Design an enzyme around this catalytic site. Structure first.
Site, short mmCIF file in Angstrom:
data_model
loop_
_atom_site.label_atom_id
_atom_site.label_comp_id
_atom_site.label_asym_id
_atom_site.label_seq_id
_atom_site.Cartn_x
_atom_site.Cartn_y
_atom_site.Cartn_z
N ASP A 138 0.90 -1.15 0.00
CA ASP A 138 0.00 0.00 0.00
C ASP A 138 0.94 1.20 0.00
O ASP A 138 1.54 1.56 1.01
CB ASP A 138 -0.92 0.04 1.20
CG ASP A 138 -2.06 1.03 1.04
OD1 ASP A 138 -1.92 1.96 0.21
OD2 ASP A 138 -3.12 0.87 1.70
N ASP B 79 -1.27 4.60 2.42
CA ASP B 79 -2.47 4.20 3.14
C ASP B 79 -2.93 5.46 3.86
O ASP B 79 -2.20 5.96 4.71
CB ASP B 79 -2.24 3.03 4.11
CG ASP B 79 -3.60 2.52 4.60
OD1 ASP B 79 -4.59 2.37 3.83
OD2 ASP B 79 -3.69 2.28 5.82
N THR C 183 -4.94 7.94 1.58
CA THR C 183 -4.82 8.97 0.54
C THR C 183 -5.64 10.21 0.86
O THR C 183 -5.22 11.36 0.59
CB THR C 183 -5.23 8.41 -0.84
OG1 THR C 183 -4.42 7.24 -1.07
CG2 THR C 183 -5.00 9.42 -1.95
N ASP D 8 -4.10 -3.17 2.80
CA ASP D 8 -4.38 -2.30 3.94
C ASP D 8 -3.89 -2.89 5.25
O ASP D 8 -3.56 -2.18 6.21
CB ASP D 8 -5.88 -2.04 4.06
CG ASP D 8 -6.43 -1.18 2.94
OD1 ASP D 8 -5.91 -0.08 2.70
OD2 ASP D 8 -7.41 -1.60 2.31
#
Ligand SMILES: [Mg+2]
Ligand SMILES: [Mg+2]
Ligand SMILES: [Mg+2]
Ligand SMILES: [Mg+2]
Ligand SMILES: [Mg+2]
Ligand SMILES: [Mg+2]
Lengths: 274, 274
Positions: free
Chosen positions: B88, B91, B93, B218
């Site tokens: 990711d 993580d 955004t 995630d």
């Protein structure tokens, strides 16, 4: 500059209070219940408030005080024109109990019922937020500025679920969140303290904060930081912000604030002046 | 120790990626949407991912890759037994776009479909969270340990509202929060990123995290940090944690995890392996 001397003294005091909080975090706690099972107080909250008020009162015996745990121990919560210190010894008691790293000491100084300066010390981050009318807003010396997004559909909002566990009340809070989330907006945040949520808006990290159920001590220190960073305060009704009303919108700008007001259903609450 | 050499190298790259993210916060952004009006991506997300994969692949060309933005571009997210990097690049955004100071670079390394190590770099905080099976979990060299509250009515839980703006989806997510809030619990928190929410549980700052709608990237890097800090992972069905199912409970202990699973309603989701 008498109010600057008051402020300098209080910044030192807030630092000392934050050391007490950090040390307590590493010891066993006495967790007591106030207005709901989610409305907590510890011995540290009470000890820090006594430290703060007895010190400031000794130095400034003609001033007035409004403190959260003092009001819990029976002091009246009245705002006059007299210079008044509005104190939250630990804003985010639940965070403190769990070690969630957003715990603030908050001190507001109010004269003629207008915010004059505010101090919000984020204890576990070692971030001292300050603001004073006509002087700017700072975090550890770095000047603060709000963001500038006037389109709610591109906004990041901040709020909290609150200490209430009454079903009707929780349902309106969540219904307000549902309405805003689906306008749509970018998201909702919160760190579990009104003061530090407002300081995030002051710093430009989110676009606006709102909450109903707060008290004057949750917001008096951070309010002037928000406005000295270029933001605005409003009541959730659209009208002028009222420190004793239990309601706040703290926004980077007026467009966003007025729009948020339009989408929010009001919950009933006991004013800090009744 | 082959995997330690992999880990040491990847920690250097995570640091380099975080400096790229911090420099991008300064400059103008190109904000694009992916799976919903609130599912954002920037050029920086895409840049960091390509930097990470091209660099790791040159050193370890036989290894496999699963990257958020690569999958968005049409790459498959198939988990085999082969050593696999699950990435990711940013993580949080939405937090990045707004300057909300919880933005992570997350790298998980998975062997035989089991988490082996994880790296979660909190860019704006300069906090490097690391974990490896049989080696412990750390934040900047300090060993992490989960807290120990087995009573959900005294718990602080962490979750997010999700990127969906579909009314039927938002209604279940909010209903789940209502159910938990009124058990009652002490509160709900979140910082706007799965990986940092999990690292807060790892560090003992909250009792448990849950979410439906997340993806393997995630949670792969933080998952092993939570378990090496002494916590547990579970599916929301009560069964073993399944990295590709879009569902996670990351808890300090089994008692809380099982109670959370009993109370919430599952939302239907497209798997990462279907
Ligand atoms: Mg309180
Ligand atoms: Mg308090
Ligand atoms: Mg407070
Ligand atoms: Mg994304
Ligand atoms: Mg991402
Ligand atoms: Mg992510």
């Amino acid at each position: 500059d008498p109010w600057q001397e008051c402020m300098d003294y209080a910044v030192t005091l807030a630092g000392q209070a934050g050391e007490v909080v950090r040390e307590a975090l590493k010891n066993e706690m006495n967790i007591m219940v106030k207005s709901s099972p989610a409305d907590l107080v510890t011995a540290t909250d009470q000890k820090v408030e006594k430290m703060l008020i007895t010190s400031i009162k000794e130095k400034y015996p003609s001033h007035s005080f409004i403190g959260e745990e003092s009001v819990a121990a029976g002091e009246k919560s009245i705002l006059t024109d007299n210079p008044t210190w509005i104190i939250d010894p630990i804003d985010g008691t639940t965070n403190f109990v769990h070690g969630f790293p957003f715990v603030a000491v908050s001190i507001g100084f109010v004269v003629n019922k207008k915010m004059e300066f505010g101090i919000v010390y984020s204890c576990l981050e070692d971030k001292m937020y300050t603001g004073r009318k006509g002087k700017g807003a700072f975090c550890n010396g770095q000047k603060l500025q709000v963001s500038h997004q006037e389109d709610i559909t591109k906004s990041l909002l901040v709020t909290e679920l609150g200490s209430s566990r009454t079903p009707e009340t929780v349902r309106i809070i969540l219904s307000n969140i549902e309405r805003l989330l689906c306008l749509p907006i970018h998201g909702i945040r919160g760190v579990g303290t009104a003061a530090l949520n407002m300081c995030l808006v002051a710093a430009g990290a989110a676009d606006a904060y709102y909450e109903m159920g707060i008290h004057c001590w949750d917001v008096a220190g951070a309010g002037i930081i928000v406005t000295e960073a270029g933001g605005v305060l409003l009541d959730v009704t659209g009208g002028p912000f009222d420190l004793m009303s239990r309601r706040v919108i703290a926004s980077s700008n007026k467009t966003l604030a007025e729009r948020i007001a339009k989408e929010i259903q009001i919950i009933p609450l006991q004013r800090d002046d009744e």
